[PDB]
């Protein structure tokens, strides 16, 4: 198959900015490369069919460029309706190929540090023989953040699952959740449960922690 490498992964722009996204074809695909727009929970919208041939129903804001291996989607005068994830596609030969995707983020007006909270396991869940420690990072920007679980100063890994909301469209922020999951037996062997967060908005890494019995 032919690999379509899309650059970059994520990308921040403002309403009005002129922005362009690159798709590269591992070998020649000719003029037969198109561009799609997908918003969360929606179906992909056909922006462009092949190279620069714009399609009915799409504003002239959009433009295709390139030919051969290198191609580019360019959007003039960004509007709030165009913030989505964009995928390049080629139907030159089978199998059909898609790019890694470029998510078009709202360029955050300014840097916002997360509000960090830590939730101990509930007693009733401790009944069930399991324990879920939750760490919440609230309304931060940019999206890049690092959450590290510590259990009696021991750095955890492979132990937790992370979840991110879609970018809030009022304040352009994100929220993040990190769940650490132990058994009751495991959870009762240790005392201090800590969540350490590194983010651009925080000059130093913030640690929110609790100890067993405290709650």
């Amino acid at each position: 198959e032919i690999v379509l490498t899309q650059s970059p992964s994520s990308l921040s722009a403002s309403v009005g900015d002129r922005v362009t996204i690159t798709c590269r074809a591992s070998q020649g695909i000719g003029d037969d490369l198109g561009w799609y727009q997908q918003k969360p929970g929606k179906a992909p919208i056909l922006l462009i069919y092949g190279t620069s041939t714009l399609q009915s129903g799409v504003p002239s804001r959009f433009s295709g460029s390139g030919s051969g291996t290198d191609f580019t989607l360019t959007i003039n005068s960004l509007q709030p309706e165009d913030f989505a994830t964009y995928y390049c596609l080629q139907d030159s030969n089978y199998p059909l190929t898609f790019g890694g995707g470029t998510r078009l983020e709202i360029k955050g007006r300014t840097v916002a540090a997360p509000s960090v909270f830590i939730f101990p396991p509930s007693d009733e869940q401790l009944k069930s023989g399991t324990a879920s420690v939750v760490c919440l990072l609230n309304n931060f920007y940019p999206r890049e953040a690092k959450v590290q679980w510590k259990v009696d100063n021991a750095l955890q890994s492979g132990n937790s699952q992370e979840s991110v909301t879609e970018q809030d469209s009022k304040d352009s922020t994100y929220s993040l959740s990190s769940t650490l999951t132990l058994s009751k037996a495991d959870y009762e062997k240790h005392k201090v449960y800590a969540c350490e967060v590194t983010h651009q908005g925080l000059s130093s890494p913030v640690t929110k922690s609790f100890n067993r019995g405290e709650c």
């Binding site: 179906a43 056909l46 199998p95 059909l96 979840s163 959740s177 999951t181």
Partner: protein, 210 residues
Amino acid sequence: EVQLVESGGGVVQPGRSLRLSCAASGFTFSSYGMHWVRQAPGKELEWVAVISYDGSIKYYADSVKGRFTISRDNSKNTLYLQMNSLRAEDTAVYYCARTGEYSWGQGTTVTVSSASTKGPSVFPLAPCSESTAALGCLVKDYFPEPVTVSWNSGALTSGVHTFPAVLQSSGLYSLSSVVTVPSSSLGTKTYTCNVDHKPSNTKVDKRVHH
């Protein structure tokens, strides 16, 4: 307007079979050619199958060949995809595509897994002991998707964050729903989360105490 409506997806066990249908409308179905595509949770889209206008030439992907078979009934305006020996990798939402020498449908979701229908357990997320305070509910150990969460019967939407569910190693789903409120409000306003899981007909309201 040209359109395609997929159906036939659902929750299925591994090794079992399932056939999707795609009702085509608004265009000459017998003349145009059709494609199958799929998107896994979070990943990019992936092509899987292609058929000609008459059903002559057919080509799949490597991960699907020998198990997936494409067809079309030109009299009923329908494109078919029979998927046999389904594997966890096949879990995705499958879209129906037209081609020109394009237009994509809503897609139907196929979830392959050995887990059974199970309602969630709801647990309070309350902090241990600042201007803003946080509460929530943990909706854990449920399948299949989805579950819906509201706060105080929908009256409390400001400051609410219901995270996308994650799939746990047990094959069950889990999510959290949190709300951040002014720290003074605690003690006179009440905060209860409402959890709905239609597949198991599970409806639970839990009031979270700080």
